[PDB]
Design a protein around this ligand. Structure first.
Ligand SMILES: CN(C)CCCNc1ccn2ncc(-c3ccc4c(c3)OCO4)c2n1
Ligand SMILES: CN(C)CCCNc1ccn2ncc(-c3ccc4c(c3)OCO4)c2n1
Ligand SMILES: [Cl-]
Lengths: 286, 281
């Protein structure tokens, strides 16, 4: 695709920013990128060593989705090097790294959380969740299920702007408004809706469940969901109606929004437009 | 769904052959973590009615495990409880009643074959490498006769136990003849193009393993990205004879990579070529 193809000689790769089930991401610079003169600092996504077909399919899927979507709170694709060498996706650089990393650093780095980019209040946290909701609201309009919504898969960029990232597992639902997988998925159990875990059904409403988990991660400043609970225990724990407890740093209204995202019946869960409205009300009143 | 049914069976059956009391198990240092989960060294008291403490390896889910990772563990339990061979890593038991699911396995003090070769500045004869290749062939021959496809054969997925005995490990992806999770550089052409896996696709993987052995842990198709390998294999390219590799050994490799699965050797033939190398010093 000439719209996206970038000259490989104008890209220079540097240190690894992260490596895992999502693949490899390095910090880079691009010369004469999309008409910007001189060098622009970028992130480059590529396959890790000993890549499987699934990891190549995920890199290509990501390329295909980010070609079609544009939102202030979705990480930007700028280009690709897809000829005569490894597939490289050139992306928007997010200087603060993952949201999980950023929130966790805030327990340790002053001014920290207060109940300046390192100073955080409950207002900041509600704003982070609101930015992510708006991104997801747009993605749902675009008939996309992300499936991998989690604090580790959100990026924090210039001005502490939230950028939804990690589109490798995202799927089109234009027909039936569900994505169904015969085999077992690669989404961590503890972020999965009950119907995704038992029935392999992914919808915008299963993204709403995952958003509720992300909400619990945000207010706990990067806490580990269902802490101490082995993942195989979540089958029984969720079907008997157990949900994570209200954490210490959480209003009743915020906990009620989480509980609503974890309703057993997907249709009883709020939609992203309603989540964005609930987070707007919370902001304004405080 | 299929996984909730297996998890629940596993927590319920409490099979006295396999269930090991959690209080008799003492977990020690981490041996390895990755896509295969987490394995730690441990001691097990009265394992299988053995006296005192047996040193064991314990496999468990790593952090943030997916349904795929949990299915791989149960699936390993399912396959390994049915197999018994000196060059296949043994299952001794499971803990399914007390916190995280644990599999209790034969311990391999030298770790992975890949790690054991890359540190070889230890001394190996071509005779040893060919012993290693032969042992794996024996394990694979026994698995194929049981109609199990391993799918995942690689030097990183072979363990080295006491006396440098080879142990085939990583049975999570294995299938009983009668998804895209294997690294592309170990996959047969028909697995890449048509998603077929048979004993003959295990033989292709075995040919890549021979090449890792002879290069003392080399990286297959060095500096070729996996995305390009699809067209290079399709057009009949294969890795060059490596340094310190006989014609005989390299001919065995090339036959494991025939395009037509029917033209590859079976494991009995691979075993016989290494038995014949052996007697012919
Ligand atoms: C798991 N997710 C977050 C992977 C997202 C992969 N795509 C991108 C795109 C742009 N940027 N800009 C910075 C990073 C980055 C920084 C630190 C990290 C990092 C990515 O992964 C862990 O630590 C990045 N990644
Ligand atoms: C990827 N494969 C090899 C994982 C196999 C997992 N099952 C077992 C079973 C028994 N043992 N006894 C030692 C190890 C071990 C040591 C160092 C490692 C290691 C496993 O993995 C990497 O480094 C072991 N693993
Ligand atoms: Cl990404």
């Amino acid at each position: 695709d000439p719209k996206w193809e970038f000259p490989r000689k104008n890209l220079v790769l540097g240190k690894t920013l992260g490596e895992g089930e999502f693949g490899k991401v390095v910090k880079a610079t691009a010369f004469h990128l999309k008409g910007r003169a001189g060098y622009t600092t970028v992130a480059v996504k590529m396959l890790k060593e000993n890549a499987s077909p699934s990891e190549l399919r995920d890199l290509l899927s990501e390329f295909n989705v980010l070609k079609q979507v544009n939102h202030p709170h979705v990480i930007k694709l700028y280009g690709a090097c897809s000829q005569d060498g490894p597939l490289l996706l050139i992306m928007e650089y997010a200087k603060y790294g993952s949201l999980r990393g950023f929130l966790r650093e805030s327990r340790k780095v002053g001014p920290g959380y207060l109940g300046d980019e390192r100073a955080l209040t409950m207002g900041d946290l509600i704003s982070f969740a609101w930015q992510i909701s708006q991104g997801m609201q747009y993605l749902a309009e675009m008939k996309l299920v992300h499936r991998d919504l989690a604090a580790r898969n959100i990026l924090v960029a210039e001005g502490r702007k939230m950028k939804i990232s990690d589109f490798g597992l995202s799927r089109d639902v234009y027909e039936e408004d569900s994505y169904v997988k015969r085999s077992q998925g690669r989404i961590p159990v503890k972020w999965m809706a009950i119907e995704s875990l038992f029935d392999h059904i992914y919808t915008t409403q299963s993204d709403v469940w995952s958003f509720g988990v992300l909400l619990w991660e945000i207010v706990t400043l990067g806490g580990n969901p269902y802490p101490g609970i082995p993942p195989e225990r979540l089958f029984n724990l969720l079907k008997t109606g157990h949900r994570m407890e209200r954490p210490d740093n959480c209003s009743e209204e915020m906990y009620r929004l989480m509980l609503q995202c974890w309703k057993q019946e997907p249709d009883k869960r709020p939609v992203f437009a309603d989540i964005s409205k609930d987070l707007e009300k919370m902001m304004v009143k405080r």
